[PDB]
Amino acid sequence: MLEQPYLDLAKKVLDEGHFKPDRTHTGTYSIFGHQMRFDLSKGFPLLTTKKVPFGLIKSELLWFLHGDTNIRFLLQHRNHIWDEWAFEKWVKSDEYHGPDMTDFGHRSQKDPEFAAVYHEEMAKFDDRVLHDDAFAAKYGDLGLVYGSQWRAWHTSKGDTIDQLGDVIEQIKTHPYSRRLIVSAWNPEDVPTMALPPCHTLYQFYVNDGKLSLQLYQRSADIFLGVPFNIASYALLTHLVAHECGLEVGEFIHTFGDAHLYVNHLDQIKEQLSRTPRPAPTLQLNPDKHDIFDFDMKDIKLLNYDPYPAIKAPVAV
Amino acid sequence: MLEQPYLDLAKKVLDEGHFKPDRTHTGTYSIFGHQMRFDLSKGFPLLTTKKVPFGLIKSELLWFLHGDTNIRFLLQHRNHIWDEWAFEKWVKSDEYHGPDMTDFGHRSQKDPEFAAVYHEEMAKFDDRVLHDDAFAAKYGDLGLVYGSQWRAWHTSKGDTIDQLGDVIEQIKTHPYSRRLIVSAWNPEDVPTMALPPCHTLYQFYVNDGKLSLQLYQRSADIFLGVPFNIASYALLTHLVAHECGLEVGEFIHTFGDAHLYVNHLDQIKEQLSRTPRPAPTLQLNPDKHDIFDFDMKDIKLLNYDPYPAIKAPVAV
Ligand SMILES: Nc1nc(=O)c2c([nH]1)NCC(CNc1ccc(C(=O)N[C@@H](CCC(=O)O)C(=O)O)cc1)=N2
Ligand SMILES: Nc1nc(=O)c2c([nH]1)NCC(CNc1ccc(C(=O)N[C@@H](CCC(=O)O)C(=O)O)cc1)=N2
Ligand SMILES: Cc1cn([C@@H]2C[C@H](O)[C@@H](COP(=O)(O)O)O2)c(=O)[nH]c1=O
Ligand SMILES: Cc1cn([C@@H]2C[C@H](O)[C@@H](COP(=O)(O)O)O2)c(=O)[nH]c1=O
Residues belonging to chain B? 316
Q: Is A274 annotated as a binding residue?
A: no
Q: How far is CA A118 from the centre of its chain?
A: 24
Pick from A245, A235, A237: which is nearest to A300 by CA?
A235
Mutate which of A81, A221, A316 for ligand 3 pocket (most atoms within 8 A of beta carbon): A221
Pick from A76, A57, A79: which is nearest to A234 by CA?
A57
Are residues A187 and B157, on separate chains, in Cβ contact within 8 Å? no
- The answer to whether B188 and A159 are in contact (CB under 8 A) is no
CA distance A102 to A91: 7
- The answer to whether B213 and B253 are in contact (CB under 8 A) is no
Q: Are strands A300-302 and B29-30 parallel, antiparallel or unpaired?
A: unpaired
CA distance B4 to B257: 19
What would the 3-class secondary structure string for B141-187 be? ECCCCHHHHHCCEECCCCCEECHHHHHHHHHHHCCCCCCCEEECCCH
What would the 3-class secondary structure string for chain A be? CCCHHHHHHHHHHHHHCECCCCCCCCCCEECCCEEEEEECCCCCCCCCCCCCCCHHHHHHHHHHHCCCCECHHHHHCCCCCCCCHHHHHHHHCCCCCCCCCCCCHHHCCCCCCCCCCCHHHHHHHHHHHHHCHHHHHHHHECCCCHHHHHCCEECCCCCEECHHHHHHHHHHHCCCCCCCEEECCCHHHCCCCCCCCCEEEEECEECCCCEEEEEEECEEECCCCCHHHHHHHHHHHHHHHHHCCCCCCEEEEEECEEEECHHHCHHHHCCCCCCCCCCCEEECCCCCCCCCCCCCCCCEEECCCCCCCCCCCCCC
Residues 6+ apart with CB under 8 A from A138: none
Residues 6+ apart with CB under 8 A from B202: B181, B182, B213, B214, B215, B216, B233, B236
Which element (helix H / strand E) includes B130?
Answer: helix B119-131
User: What is the number of the ligand 4 atom nearest to the C-alpha of B224?
Assistant: 18
Is residue B163 less than 8 Å (CB to CB) from chain A?
Answer: yes
Residues 6+ apart with CB under 8 A from B138: none
Q: Are strands B34-39 and B205-206 parallel, antiparallel or unpaired?
A: unpaired
CA distance A207 to B31: 9
Residues 6+ apart with CB under 8 A from B188: A153, A155, A156, A161
Query: What is the phi/psi pair of residue A220, to 5°?
Result: -170, 120
Long-range contacts of A243-247 (CB under 8 A, 24+ apart): A243/A168, A243/A171, A243/A289, A243/A290, A243/A291, A244/A168, A244/A171, A244/A172, A244/A206, A244/A211, A245/A289, A246/A171, A246/A206, A246/A209, A246/A210, A246/A211, A247/A41, A247/A209, A247/A210, A247/A211
Expressed in angstroms and rounded, the spacing between residue A196 Cα and the centre of ligand 1 is 15
Pick from B146, B24, B262, B23: which is nearest to A170 by CA?
B23
Q: What resolution in angstroms does the PDB record give?
A: 2.5
CA distance A186 to B189: 13
- Greatest Cα pair distance in chain B: 60
| Side chain identity, residue B134 | A
C-beta B121 within 6 A of ligand 4: no
Query: What are the residues facing A215 on neighbouring strands?
Result: A202, A253
Are residues B181 and A21, on separate chains, in Cβ contact within 8 Å? no
Query: What are the residues facing A38 on neighbouring strands?
Result: A251
In chain B, the domains with their CATH numbers are 1-316 (3.30.572.10)
Residues 6+ apart with CB under 8 A from A115: none
Q: Is A198 a catalytic residue?
A: yes
Is residue B35 less than 8 Å (CB to CB) from chain A?
Answer: yes
